[PDB]
Amino acid sequence: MNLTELKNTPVSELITLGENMGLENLARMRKQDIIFAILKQHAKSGEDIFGDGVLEILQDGFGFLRSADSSYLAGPDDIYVSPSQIRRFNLRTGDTISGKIRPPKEGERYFALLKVNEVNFDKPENARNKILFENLTPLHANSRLRMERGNGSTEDLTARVLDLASPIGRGQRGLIVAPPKAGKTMLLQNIAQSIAYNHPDCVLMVLLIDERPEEVTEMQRLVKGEVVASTFDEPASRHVQVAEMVIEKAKRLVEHKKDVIILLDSITRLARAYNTVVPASGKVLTGGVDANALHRPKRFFGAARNVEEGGSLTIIATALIDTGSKMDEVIYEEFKGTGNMELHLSRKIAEKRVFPAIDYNRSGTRKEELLTTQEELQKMWILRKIIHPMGEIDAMEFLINKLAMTKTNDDFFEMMK
Amino acid sequence: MNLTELKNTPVSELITLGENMGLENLARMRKQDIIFAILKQHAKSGEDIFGDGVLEILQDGFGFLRSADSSYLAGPDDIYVSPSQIRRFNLRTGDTISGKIRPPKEGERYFALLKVNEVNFDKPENARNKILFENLTPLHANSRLRMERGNGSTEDLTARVLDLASPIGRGQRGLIVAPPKAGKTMLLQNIAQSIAYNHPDCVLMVLLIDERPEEVTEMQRLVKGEVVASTFDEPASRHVQVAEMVIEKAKRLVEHKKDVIILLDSITRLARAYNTVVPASGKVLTGGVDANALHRPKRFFGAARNVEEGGSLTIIATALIDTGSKMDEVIYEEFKGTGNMELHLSRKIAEKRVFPAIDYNRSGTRKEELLTTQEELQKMWILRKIIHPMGEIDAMEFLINKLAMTKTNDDFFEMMK
RNA sequence: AUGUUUUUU
Numbered sequence A, B: 001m002n003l004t005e006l007k008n009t010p011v012s013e014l015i016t017l018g019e020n021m022g023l024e025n026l027a028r029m030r031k032q033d034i035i036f037a038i039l040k041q042h043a044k045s046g047e048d049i050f051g052d053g054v055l056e057i058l059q060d061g062f063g064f065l066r067s068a069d070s071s072y073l074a075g076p077d078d079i080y081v082s083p084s085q086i087r088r089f090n091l092r093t094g095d096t097i098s099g100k101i102r103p104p105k106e107g108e109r110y111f112a113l114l115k116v117n118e119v120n121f122d123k124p125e126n127a128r129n130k131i132l133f134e135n136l137t138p139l140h141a142n143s144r145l146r147m148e149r150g151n152g153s154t155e156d157l158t159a160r161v162l163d164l165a166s167p168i169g170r171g172q173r174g175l176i177v178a179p180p181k182a183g184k185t186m187l188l189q190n191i192a193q194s195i196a197y198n199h200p201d202c203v204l205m206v207l208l209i210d211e212r213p214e215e216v217t218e219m220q221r222l223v224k225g226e227v228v229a230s231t232f233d234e235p236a237s238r239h240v241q242v243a244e245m246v247i248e249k250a251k252r253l254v255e256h257k258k259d260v261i262i263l264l265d266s267i268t269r270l271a272r273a274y275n276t277v278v279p280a281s282g283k284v285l286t287g288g289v290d291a292n293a294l295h296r297p298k299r300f301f302g303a304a305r306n307v308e309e310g311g312s313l314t315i316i317a318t319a320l321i322d323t324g325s326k327m328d329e330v331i332y333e334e335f336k337g338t339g340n341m342e343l344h345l346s347r348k349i350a351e352k353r354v355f356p357a358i359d360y361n362r363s364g365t366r367k368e369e370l371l372t373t374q375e376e377l378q379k380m381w382i383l384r385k386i387i388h389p390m391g392e393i394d395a396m397e398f399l400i401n402k403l404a405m406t407k408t409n410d411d412f413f414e415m416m417k
Numbered sequence C: 001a002u003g004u005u006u007u008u009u
């Protein structure tokens, strides 16, 4: 008796099971209400019920166990967590809790937690003694997260160009700067697919705030990982809540020496949401940005770091420029002094239908020698010195024509000499 | 005895009928008052009266049935809908209701609804069980909505250029960016005529907010569809109300697997109206735009989506640029990074009296391979690569001179090779 | 109202 197991079951089988259990007509009923009635009827027989979810401690002291399939939205099937157990096990926002639950009695509206069985997918004896995320020693990117497929596919050209322009390692904090209508969607899809193919052990999390739902359901059915999104039909409060829950879960996972990867596509939208939810202080800067509005996105971005004791946190955010709004322009570069990695995309190259439209000149990675060998770094330096004199479109055409001849970049580097 | 039937009748016949029924002199009376008196006299004999309209639920709990011929304006002949029936049939704003009505008794001012016969042009048993619009899975444009006439007319050149620049499919969410005095009116008229000619099965709705009455009555007598407009003589409150009613009706139609097409021509004017009706919060951004003013137009724009279960919602809005106001430059923009189709028009080409004055270079459609075949996409790519080096005016002249030689674009593509 | 917008290189 698990909550996620009943959530994954279809509607027809749940209706059939409820009709066999002998309850009210479930055809004219919601799936969540059907599951609730089935759990009630199964607990009336004396059997136990189990559930799971991410903890969201409220300001009063209690909390609930949000579900991932609903993008951490307030649902009727949330498991109530008393503050006594929180104080007894030192629980915090983001801790994954899995234990026995019971249906609400007369006068209650949510399931109660009796005994916790597993904390953060581990024993509670290992979670009671742990080092906080704020005390971990940061470090630079040491492990190399190669994005090249290696299967010789035609779509691998984007990953090869990305590796030649800006290699990505564990704990990297980069930025994907690109004007609208440049190809950010396809680039993010390719990055997510390459991460899921090359490094399936890492925890991939794609955050899409204030996006077109069709794109949400497309990304959810395309990438092999977790997708937490919030369409534009929701207020900025839900955006802030989702961002906080995601970053808290990422911190709790990193605290257990896990490799978390966050592919953010709405850093600008997140900053707009934070500027909308912040109370007015009577002081407005140039472009309509509050003085204390960028602090929360600043911390959300800076949360990414590489841990020496174990694990890492990678955050790749895509910033929006040339959107016609001065607020986004002020945000983007305020954040430019940030992202230890900038991958610029050119609109002029995208208009020529030359995919990918990557600005190789302005791209780059700091401390790239820690992720590449000596000969590889020398070859990349020679390639950059050869590409720099040529124009952007000409350099992109040259790179595409030279990478189409071979499958691996090593052969291209060997033929360049 | 139908309301719309009496509304379509002329004034002279209604006056004659009222004089034959033996009532007060109807020559010095309004047509609506004449219809009201005729309905009263006909109901005094014991016969039944029927009406219809779009439901507009008020904040208190009751509602009225607005009429389409009055642009959903508050009229004396609105049918009152009690909240009891709303609670009994789960009615919402936008549901088309058609049932028996009765004249108001002593102390009443509006017609009452006794029994509902048809809901959303369908049986109530099919409307009681339905999936909300917020739960439908979005998708990209799959079905091709070809705009080419095919009759070899001289006006078909605009549709041919539009198809070669940006093909339109079901569920598309585009933008027509053009400075003033460019030819937006003729272009919108041609688009509406091509939609009514090629795809007469789709529900066409043209929304004109804050425009001149002459243009309104011109569009109403030119296109073959529904025209809901609101001239500048009305406050922004009526603009917001009309936009809400139109989008709610569109959502209710899409919920019944219908293909709705909305040709918006005032996205900038709608954003200005929303910025005017929003209460001041003491925080003004660059250009005079409120922080929470663009949220409602953002949702109105993002409502457009393609449904996998059935139906679609297409919204083609025309944004205004270079109007001398910085608010529109932020308002029209901020919207640039939202849609997935931009059809730019050049003022320099319009000054040369070269119609249509379309910027073929900056135009385009994302995921265009889902609406065109392989050979068609290759021919469009070759045409774009040939047109790109030439200047805007030169490319437009070349395209016009090459399309004037033949009737179909297939012959042009075959002759280009 | 100052900042924002005006405003840019």
Ligand SMILES: Nc1ncnc2c1ncn2[C@@H]1O[C@H](COP(=O)(O)OP(=O)(O)O)[C@@H](O)[C@H]1O
Residues within 6 Å of the ligand: A158, A178, A179, A180, A181, A182, A183, A184, A185, A186, A187, A355, A356, B365, B366, B367, B368
């Ligand atoms: N690698 C690519 N190959 C082919 N087309 C692409 C590629 N990247 C982008 N595009 C085209 O650009 C359009 C928009 O790209 P997108 O990633 O949505 O840009 P952004 O996210 O910056 O708005 C897509 O619909 C696609 O047709």
Ligand SMILES: Nc1ncnc2c1ncn2[C@@H]1O[C@H](COP(=O)(O)OP(=O)(O)O)[C@@H](O)[C@H]1O
Residues within 6 Å of the ligand: B158, B178, B179, B180, B181, B182, B183, B184, B185, B186, B187, B355, B356
């Ligand atoms: N396809 C066309 N053919 C001929 N003249 C046109 C065409 N499109 C626009 N025009 C001219 O431009 C004028 C204004 O066009 P309009 O569509 O009103 O531009 P906008 O809507 O951008 O203000 C029209 O009065 C018309 O004379």
Ligand code: BEF
Residues within 6 Å of the ligand: A179, A180, A181, A182, A184, A185, A320, B336, B337, B338, B339
């Ligand atoms: F319009 Be893109 F997604 F920035």
Ligand code: BEF
Residues within 6 Å of the ligand: B179, B180, B181, B182, B184, B185, B320
């Ligand atoms: F003056 Be146009 F209608 F934009």
Ligand SMILES: [Mg+2]
Residues within 6 Å of the ligand: A184, A185
């Ligand atoms: Mg995008």
Ligand SMILES: [Mg+2]
Residues within 6 Å of the ligand: B184, B185
């Ligand atoms: Mg116009």
